[PDB]
Design an enzyme around this catalytic site. Structure first.
Site, PDB file in Angstrom:
ATOM      1  N   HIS B  41      40.660  29.337 -74.617  1.00 57.47           N
ATOM      2  CA  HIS B  41      41.025  29.679 -73.245  1.00 57.47           C
ATOM      3  C   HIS B  41      42.521  29.719 -73.009  1.00 57.47           C
ATOM      4  CE1 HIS B  41      41.976  25.629 -71.676  1.00 57.47           C
ATOM      5  NE2 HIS B  41      40.783  25.185 -72.035  1.00 57.47           N
ATOM      6  N   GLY B 143      47.067  20.069 -69.190  1.00 59.63           N
ATOM      7  CA  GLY B 143      47.947  20.078 -70.331  1.00 59.63           C
ATOM      8  C   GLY B 143      47.414  19.343 -71.542  1.00 59.63           C
ATOM      9  N   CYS B 145      44.500  19.806 -72.977  1.00 55.16           N
ATOM     10  CA  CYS B 145      43.563  20.571 -73.784  1.00 55.16           C
ATOM     11  C   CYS B 145      44.122  20.723 -75.193  1.00 55.16           C
ATOM     12  CB  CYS B 145      43.313  21.952 -73.173  1.00 55.16           C
ATOM     13  SG  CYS B 145      42.429  21.855 -71.637  1.00 55.16           S
TER      14      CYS B 145
HETATM   15  C1  LIG Z   1      43.564  22.062 -70.404  1.00 60.66           C
HETATM   16  O1  LIG Z   1      44.837  21.463 -70.584  1.00 60.66           O
HETATM   17  C2  LIG Z   1      43.019  21.604 -69.021  1.00 60.66           C
HETATM   18  C3  LIG Z   1      42.534  20.150 -69.051  1.00 60.66           C
HETATM   19  C4  LIG Z   1      42.460  19.449 -67.688  1.00 60.66           C
HETATM   20  C5  LIG Z   1      42.813  20.068 -66.516  1.00 60.66           C
HETATM   21  C6  LIG Z   1      42.710  19.371 -65.322  1.00 60.66           C
HETATM   22  C7  LIG Z   1      42.257  18.068 -65.337  1.00 60.66           C
HETATM   23  N1  LIG Z   1      41.911  17.506 -66.500  1.00 60.66           N
HETATM   24  C8  LIG Z   1      41.981  18.145 -67.654  1.00 60.66           C
HETATM   25  O2  LIG Z   1      41.639  17.582 -68.671  1.00 60.66           O
HETATM   26  N2  LIG Z   1      41.873  22.430 -68.720  1.00 60.66           N
HETATM   27  C9  LIG Z   1      41.822  23.260 -67.552  1.00 60.66           C
HETATM   28  O3  LIG Z   1      42.675  23.233 -66.713  1.00 60.66           O
HETATM   29  C10 LIG Z   1      40.582  24.115 -67.464  1.00 60.66           C
HETATM   30  C11 LIG Z   1      40.892  25.599 -67.731  1.00 60.66           C
HETATM   31  C12 LIG Z   1      39.670  26.522 -67.795  1.00 60.66           C
HETATM   32  C13 LIG Z   1      38.616  26.069 -68.799  1.00 60.66           C
HETATM   33  C14 LIG Z   1      37.451  27.057 -68.730  1.00 60.66           C
HETATM   34  C15 LIG Z   1      37.926  28.465 -69.112  1.00 60.66           C
HETATM   35  C16 LIG Z   1      39.117  28.948 -68.292  1.00 60.66           C
HETATM   36  C17 LIG Z   1      40.215  27.899 -68.187  1.00 60.66           C
HETATM   37  N3  LIG Z   1      40.062  23.999 -66.145  1.00 60.66           N
HETATM   38  C18 LIG Z   1      39.356  22.813 -65.779  1.00 60.66           C
HETATM   39  O4  LIG Z   1      39.237  21.944 -66.582  1.00 60.66           O
HETATM   40  C19 LIG Z   1      38.794  22.752 -64.371  1.00 60.66           C
HETATM   41  C20 LIG Z   1      38.899  23.747 -63.393  1.00 60.66           C
HETATM   42  C21 LIG Z   1      38.208  23.228 -62.259  1.00 60.66           C
HETATM   43  C22 LIG Z   1      37.950  23.716 -60.956  1.00 60.66           C
HETATM   44  C23 LIG Z   1      37.225  22.937 -60.062  1.00 60.66           C
HETATM   45  C24 LIG Z   1      36.754  21.683 -60.449  1.00 60.66           C
HETATM   46  C25 LIG Z   1      37.000  21.202 -61.723  1.00 60.66           C
HETATM   47  C26 LIG Z   1      37.733  21.997 -62.630  1.00 60.66           C
HETATM   48  N4  LIG Z   1      38.090  21.726 -63.914  1.00 60.66           N
END
Ligand SMILES: *[C@H](O)[C@H](Cc1ccc[nH]c1=O)NC(=O)[C@H](CC1CCCCC1)NC(=O)c1cc2ccccc2[nH]1
Ligand SMILES: *[C@H](O)[C@H](Cc1ccc[nH]c1=O)NC(=O)[C@H](CC1CCCCC1)NC(=O)c1cc2ccccc2[nH]1
Ligand code: NA
Lengths: 303, 302
Positions: B41, B143, B145
């Site tokens: 992603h 960040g 991930c």
């Molecule tokens: C990667 O670094 C990041 C990890 C992260 C982000 C926020 C909080 N804790 C974490 O561990 N991942 C994301 O930001 C991820 C991106 C998304 C993954 C699926 C494919 C497209 C990109 N998004 C989420 O983890 C996310 C979005 C979202 C929206 C509403 C509720 C929860 C939620 N989690």
């Protein structure tokens, strides 16, 4: 989101661990520059351990009596001296893996990571706090002596492990060889003082709970520092000082909860209990996170 | 003595962490030999996110679009491909710190250490379990991930988890290092019940006994069927004979039969702890496996 007991990455300290053998005893040493630091009790025979005269015992040792092994490589000891309860073995090779480092003596309530080791090799890493009674609640078996505690700021070493007290808690020194607490390095049962809860750290962890959206315990009252401490005392909590209030300031600003307001919520938790509820997944109030530990974890500080 | 949630030493993994940036997204990669592994992603834009066509998006990226930084050295990307939900960036330098390693897919109820990283740099290490519902109760921020989970056995790092996302409840989801998600989750922007790991609770009660915390022991025994009737009511996984067998070492070490210990757990479930703690906890802990207890209580090293 989430909140875990998080240790520092251990690689920088792993590169400093060696094995030290004198006679029948093998324990761990810390190799920094051309010096290996380890507990002075390595020099005792089993009989010596009862009432050692360390200065006299050390006079009888020569450099060759100390077998220092860094992995599969024997290090040549070229001098030996004692500083308080730590033995310093000068070796003819500086550790190429030595990080930037300093030795610090920590205060009660401060946390650190322990790299538990046996025979110079790591078993695991975990976070500890220096208890108000100057013990640590570690996981240490025979052979673990010389394992160290540290923070990463520069690696700051703050603890070297020496012994296990009767309650199953642990005692040791700073890296200048001074014990934390009243304990001595002799084979006899030694009592720790009654322990207490690290109030400033409990408050820090309540702020971590609020940052993470777990805020059911926030009430609508305030308190004075004096009135809070009158309650704290009754529940075996340490006094909260104005310095602690100032240290908690940035967390209060980030969450919008003034420290004295958080103290009123803690007062209610002490007086009424948690009534079967959890905070950050715990059914007890956690006191082994400092204010910096909360900021470090909730903001992603790295090294 | 003493029993702590102990993580594996992290140095072998630290030497593999790098920063990966694509577009405006930065996350972590795992650099083993001449490949950097990271969540696919990383290539998505904010619009790409509802139903990304990863095959098409990847075709449309240049090797030049991936900025890979190993400390203060930029690695030259010479190829990009994908295996399930993991991107593989081939680089022109093999990591000299690559440890002996394997990629393993772990089972629910097993544990591992997480090296949480930001911008390719390690921030902290902690132990956790794969939940029966295929999530982890981690500590991860935006960040993080590409941070990995792992076990060590002697000199060999078995990588089992790569972090991809946080679910609305604040728990975490990711893949093995072959890019297959644990659980039903998918790497797209859409909205996406757990149980207690009984065998691990029992392992931890054995750890308590080994470490001198014995107050909860009672003189009673139970049958496996009678225990499971109680267990199920409290949302504990059924205890199988396989689980009983895996507790053999700890039962032998303490002299307490598994079905004797089960009667102690039954009483703790039905009556609570009466204001007491076990190994410093006021809750029954299920994130230590039988092997974790033996490892820690016997001083196994790496
Ligand atoms: C990667 O670094 C990041 C990890 C992260 C982000 C926020 C909080 N804790 C974490 O561990 N991942 C994301 O930001 C991820 C991106 C998304 C993954 C699926 C494919 C497209 C990109 N998004 C989420 O983890 C996310 C979005 C979202 C929206 C509403 C509720 C929860 C939620 N989690
Ligand atoms: C060093 O590897 C070892 C650490 C250890 C041992 C057992 C359990 N947990 C541990 O962490 N330390 C000792 O074995 C230590 C050596 C002794 C220290 C004083 C100078 C002489 C050598 N001894 C103890 O920890 C010890 C002795 C003793 C006597 C009565 C009650 C408790 C007790 N603990
Ligand atoms: Na029993």
């Amino acid at each position: 989101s989430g909140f875990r007991k998080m240790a520092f990455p251990s690689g920088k300290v792993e590169g400093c661990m060696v094995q030290v053998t004198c006679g029948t005893t093998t324990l761990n040493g810390l190799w920094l520059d051309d010096v290996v630091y380890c507990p002075r009790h390595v020099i005792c025979t089993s009989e010596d351990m009862l009432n050692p005269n360390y200065e006299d015992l050390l006079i009888r040792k020569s450099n060759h009596n100390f077998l220092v092994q860094a992995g599969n490589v024997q290090l040549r000891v070229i001098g030996h001296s004692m500083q308080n309860c730590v033995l310093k073995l000068k070796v003819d090779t500086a550790n190429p893996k030595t990080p930037k480092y300093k030795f610090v003596r920590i205060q009660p309530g401060q946390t650190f990571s322990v790299l538990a080791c046996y025979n110079g090799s790591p078993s695991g890493v975990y976070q500890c706090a220096m208890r108000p009674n100057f013990t640590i609640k570690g996981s240490f078996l025979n052979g673990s002596c010389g394992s160290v505690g540290f923070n990463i700021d520069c690696v700051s070493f703050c603890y070297m492990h020496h012994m296990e007290l009767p309650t199953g808690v642990h005692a040791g020194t700073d890296l200048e060889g001074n014990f934390y607490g009243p304990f001595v390095d002799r084979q006899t049962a030694q009592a720790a003082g009654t322990d207490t809860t690290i109030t400033v750290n409990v408050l820090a962890w309540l702020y971590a709970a609020v940052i993470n959206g777990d805020r059911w315990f926030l009430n609508r009252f305030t308190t004075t520092l004096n009135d809070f401490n009158l309650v704290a005392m009754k529940y075996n909590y340490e006094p909260l000082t104005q310095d602690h209030v100032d240290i908690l300031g940035p967390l209060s600003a980030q969450t919008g909860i003034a420290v004295l307001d958080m103290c009123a919520s803690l007062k209610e938790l002490l007086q009424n209990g948690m009534n079967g509820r959890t905070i950050l997944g715990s059914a007890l109030l956690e006191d082994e996170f400092t204010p910096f530990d909360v900021v470090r974890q909730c903001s992603g500080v790295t090294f």
